[PDB]
């Protein structure tokens, strides 16, 4: 435990989309583990439900093919068919008012989930504090 511990307000009774105001893009987990954003709002692989483990601690959940967000080795995301350290996230309050998640695997090295204006997913080492990249907004689905 070495980092804030703000916490967002909301709870996890229900599934939400990972808006990411950086480029407008929610977070998506594809069938084939494969993740990246999107803004098409009807998109099926966009609902996730996140579940916490301990106070502070989630795992991100895809609802339609039950994959788990989960960030490598080498910093990048992908979706796990199974539970792991990978798989664990400290959510956060940041700025007062988005979501943050920063891998436990890799907290000394603070990396975040992030989305680029392109939409595509940041690798760890290149996210930080300041970014719109790891800033979200939970909405409801």
């Given at each position: 435990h070495h980092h804030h511990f703000n916490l967002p307000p909301g709870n996890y009774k229900k599934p939400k989309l990972l808006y990411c105001?950086?480029?407008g893009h929610f977070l998506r987990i594809l069938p084939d583990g494969t993740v990246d954003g999107t803004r098409?709002?009807?998109?099926?692989?966009?609902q996730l439900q996140l579940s916490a483990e301990s106070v502070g601690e989630v795992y991100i959940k895809s609802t339609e093919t039950g994959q788990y967000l989960a960030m490598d080795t080498d910093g990048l995301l992908y979706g796990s068919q199974t539970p792991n350290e990978e798989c664990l996230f400290l959510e956060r309050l940041e700025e007062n008012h988005y979501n943050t998640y920063i891998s436990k695997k890799h907290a000394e090295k603070n990396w975040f989930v992030g989305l680029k204006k392109n939409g595509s997913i940041k690798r760890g080492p290149r996210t930080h504090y300041g970014?719109?990249?790891?800033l979200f907004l939970p909405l409801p689905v």
């Amino acid at each position: 435990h070495h980092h804030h511990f703000n916490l967002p307000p909301g709870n996890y009774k229900k599934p939400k989309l990972l808006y990411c105001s950086n480029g407008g893009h929610f977070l998506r987990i594809l069938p084939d583990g494969t993740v990246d954003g999107t803004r098409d709002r009807s998109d099926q692989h966009i609902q996730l439900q996140l579940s916490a483990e301990s106070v502070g601690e989630v795992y991100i959940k895809s609802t339609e093919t039950g994959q788990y967000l989960a960030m490598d080795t080498d910093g990048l995301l992908y979706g796990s068919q199974t539970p792991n350290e990978e798989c664990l996230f400290l959510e956060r309050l940041e700025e007062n008012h988005y979501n943050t998640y920063i891998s436990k695997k890799h907290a000394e090295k603070n990396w975040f989930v992030g989305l680029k204006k392109n939409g595509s997913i940041k690798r760890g080492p290149r996210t930080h504090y300041g970014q719109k990249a790891i800033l979200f907004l939970p909405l409801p689905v």
